[PDB]
Amino acid sequence: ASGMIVTDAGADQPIVFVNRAFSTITGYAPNEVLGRNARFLQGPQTDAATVARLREAIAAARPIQERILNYRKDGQPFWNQLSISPVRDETGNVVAFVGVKTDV
Amino acid sequence: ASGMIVTDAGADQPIVFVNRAFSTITGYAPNEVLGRNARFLQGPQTDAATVARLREAIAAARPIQERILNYRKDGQPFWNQLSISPVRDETGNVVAFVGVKTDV
Ligand SMILES: Cc1cc2nc3c(=O)[nH]c(=O)nc-3n(C[C@H](O)[C@H](O)[C@H](O)COP(=O)(O)O)c2cc1C
Ligand SMILES: Cc1cc2nc3c(=O)[nH]c(=O)nc-3n(C[C@H](O)[C@H](O)[C@H](O)COP(=O)(O)O)c2cc1C
């Protein structure tokens, strides 16, 4: 199943919701991740240029897809086919971001 | 502040998350709405044709915007400028629905 992360739009995009699949994939319970930026999923071999593209896309509220190296709670690396999109209201204001870890 | 509702994709789209603004707007606390279909917000003067258009859009996972009459927990009617979109993974599978009540 595909994991889903929802964050606030502003400040440092703290996580406000993760689905059940997220916990299966990552080994983290909601209470371990809520109120944190999702960058804690990254680790020593995560590609800097990929992180830079995510950073610029989120800052511009542009949808982006990247395959990024993440780490489970237990430290085991996994490939995250990650897609991030802004959630906008009808005035164009960004209300949230949604991230999907696609089950390929 | 715009309200946001996140539901599961399947079965009867149970609510899995609401933002703070949702509680301000509707008078319902998260624990009062989690696991329910959002149709409880409708009442006696809600337009049946508008409900039917939402029903068909969600069944087909099509984005839709409607101005729909909803009711606060205390019975106060309010106009909901509602936009619903599917959250898709990169295979096209629907992972969730997101609804926004646009603050006008
Ligand atoms: C909704 C959302 C979900 C995200 N999910 C992930 C994820 O699953 N894995 C990951 O490495 N980064 C994820 N990020 C990205 C990081 O939170 C952060 O934006 C990225 O590392 C670039 O910014 P930074 O250089 O400040 O860390 C997500 C971001 C958002 C807004
Ligand atoms: C994510 C999401 C948010 C929704 N938010 C609302 C809402 O704020 N108000 C409302 O009247 N209906 C909302 N709905 C619509 C109802 O849940 C339902 O789909 C609609 O009443 C039509 O289906 P029905 O004829 O089976 O009730 C939402 C649906 C989804 C998937």
Numbering used by the authors:
A (entry chain B), B (entry chain A): 48 to 151
What does the report in the manuscript say about this coordinate set?
Flavin-binding fluorescent proteins (FbFPs), engineered from prokaryotic and eukaryotic light, oxygen, voltage (LOV) photoreceptors, are promising fluorescent reporter proteins. Their small size (about 10 kDa for monomeric FbFPs such as the improved LOV (iLOV) protein derived from Arabidopsis thaliana phototropin photoreceptors) and their oxygen-independent fluorescence make them ideal reporters to monitor transport and anaerobic biological processes. In contrast to GFP-like fluorescent reporter proteins, whose absorption and fluorescence maxima can be tuned by exchanging certain chromophore-constituting amino acids, the absorption and fluorescence of FbFPs and other flavoproteins depends on noncovalently bound flavins, whose structure cannot be influenced by mutation. Using spectroscopy, X-ray crystallography, and quantum mechanics molecular mechanics calculations, we provide a firm structural and functional understanding of spectral tuning in FbFPs.
To verify the transferability of the blue-shifting Q489K mutation, identified for the plant FbFP iLOV, we introduced the corresponding Q148K mutation into the recently presented thermostable CagFbFP protein from thermophilic phototrophic bacterium Chloroflexus aggregans. Much like iLOV–Q489K, CagFbFP–Q148K possesses a blue-shifted S0→S1 absorption band with a maximum at around 444 nm (≈3 nm blue-shifted relative to parental CagFbFP) and a blue-shifted fluorescence-emission maximum (≈6 nm blue shift relative to parental CagFbFP; compare the gray dashed line and solid blue line). To verify that the structural changes, which we observed for iLOV–Q489K, are indeed a consequence of the introduced Q489K mutation and are not due to the observed succinimide modification, we obtained the structure of the corresponding CagFbFP–Q148K variant. Altogether, we were able to obtain three types of CagFbFP–Q148K crystals, all using the precipitant solutions with pH of 6.5 (data and refinement statistics are summarized in Table S1). Interestingly, the protein also crystallized using another precipitant solution for which we obtained crystals in two crystal forms. In all of the obtained models, the C terminus of the protein is clearly unlatched, and the side chain of the introduced lysine is facing away from FMN as was found in iLOV–Q489K. Thus, the succinimide modification present in iLOV–Q489K does not influence the backbone and the conformation of the introduced Lys because this modification is absent in all CagFbFP–Q148K structures. Therefore, we conclude that irrespective of the buffer and post-translational modification, the C terminus of the iLOV–Q489K and CagFbFP–Q148K variants is unlatched, the LOV core domain is opened up to allow solvent ingress, and the introduced lysine occupies an extended conformation facing away from the FMN chromophore. The photophysical properties of the CagFbFP variants are relatively straightforward to interpret.
